């Protein structure tokens, strides 16, 4: 379904807007999203995959994609780790799914967040990319209360083509990133 609200926002408003502050000589120099990634540090449930099939299908609902497990590399008995028996979930959503996802998060997820106040602006890692954590996961649409057996939040990475994050700072605000400023 190559169409949606935010998908347009970037073109018929946000694309030229960027050219206003930086004036790119070329049509591609103008930064774009192209990679949204999500990861859950469930080393907590690394014991039994029992409490894991759930957070997977839960994650799948809110993202549309079928998540992919991530094994342990090292081994640390300091907290029950060895080989690859452990666990973590990772899902790389791009294309349309990325937009239909970012619409929910910026227009539904964030606002219903317990005592929200604005995304931390410092979370820009030199190059144009943003990261942020969420203690809960029920702050998503298609998640009912009686469904969650345990509150397990996570964090999402978003990747732009922006070289410097100075530019990136702008591209996010223009899409709908409520920065704490």
């Amino acid at each position: 379904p190559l169409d949606l609200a935010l998908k347009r926002k970037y073109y018929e408003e946000v694309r030229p807007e960027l050219i206003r502050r930086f004036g790119y000589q070329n049509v591609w120099e103008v930064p774009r999203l192209e990679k949204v990634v999500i990861n859950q540090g469930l080393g907590e449930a690394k014991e039994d995959a029992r409490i894991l099939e759930k957070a997977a299908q839960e994650l799948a609902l809110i993202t549309g994609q079928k998540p992919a497990v991530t094994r342990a590399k090292k081994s640390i008995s300091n907290f029950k780790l060895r080989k690859g028996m452990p666990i973590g979930l990772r899902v790389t959503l791009r294309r349309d799914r990325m937009w239909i996802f970012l619409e929910k998060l910026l227009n539904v997820a964030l606002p219903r967040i317990r005592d929200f106040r604005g995304l931390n602006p410092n979370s820009f890692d030199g190059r144009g990319n943003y990261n942020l954590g969420l203690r809960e996961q029920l702050i998503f649409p298609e998640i009912t209360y009686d469904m969650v057996d345990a509150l397990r939040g996570m964090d999402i990475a978003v990747v732009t083509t922006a070289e410097t994050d100075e530019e990136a700072r702008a591209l996010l605000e223009l899409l709908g990133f409520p920065f704490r400023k």
Partner: peptide, 30 residues
């Protein structure tokens, strides 16, 4: 499949995700 998000304050959003029913309470328009 398409779905309608009935915000807790008008602004019935519409996008794509399983289960069209959406009792969203409050949103970005508040």
């Amino acid at each position: 499949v398409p779905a309608r998000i009935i915000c807790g304050c008008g602004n019935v959003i519409e996008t794509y995700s399983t289960k069209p029913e959406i009792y969203v309470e409050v949103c970005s328009k508040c």
